[PDB]
Amino acid sequence: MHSDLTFCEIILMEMESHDAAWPFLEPVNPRLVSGYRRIIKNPMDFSTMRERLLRGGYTSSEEFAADALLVFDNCQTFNEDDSEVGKAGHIMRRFFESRWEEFY
Ligand SMILES: NC(=O)c1cc(OC2CCNCC2)ccn1
């Protein structure tokens, strides 16, 4: 309900300020990341999710979690599990999955 979206605000704020958030704060600039345009067919990042959440672009917490899990699916698609970005994506994905279950 109304709490459906105040939930997402808590988690997105906590993800935005997380230590391991840096690879996901703003969209990937494909000019600087070769191959990213070819490989990732639906880029997503925390700032895009913030924009959408601010303008009411989510009708439920489900669609919010869809965008979050898309951030981490793209991360694992593009980065090796032992790359620096990959390690941060695993730390972030486990955080998100945890906090998400601590409400639902
Ligand atoms: N969130 C991401 O997927 C992501 C990928 C990325 O690619 C870079 C990673 C470092 N070496 C060159 C390519 C850089 C930042 N972030």
Author numbering: 1795 to 1898
Paper passage:
BAZ2A is an epigenetic regulator affecting transcription of ribosomal RNA. It is overexpressed in aggressive and recurrent prostate cancer, promoting cellular migration. BAZ2A, however, features a shallow pocket, making it one of the least druggable bromodomains. Here, we describe a structure-based fragment-growing campaign for the identification of ligands of the BAZ2A bromodomain.
The binding mode of compound 13 is unexpected. It runs parallel to the end of the αB helix, similarly to the Kac residue of acetylated peptides, instead of facing the WPF shelf of the ZA loop. Consequently, the charged piperidine is not directed toward Glu1820 but rather exposed to the solvent. The amide of compound 13 does not reciprocally interact with the side chain of Asn1823, unusually placing the amide nitrogen in the small pocket reserved for the KAc methyl group in physiological ligands. While the amide oxygen interacts with both Asn1823 and Tyr1830 (W1-bridged), the amide nitrogen establishes H-bonds to main-chain oxygens of Pro1817 and Val1865, the latter mediated by a water molecule (W3).
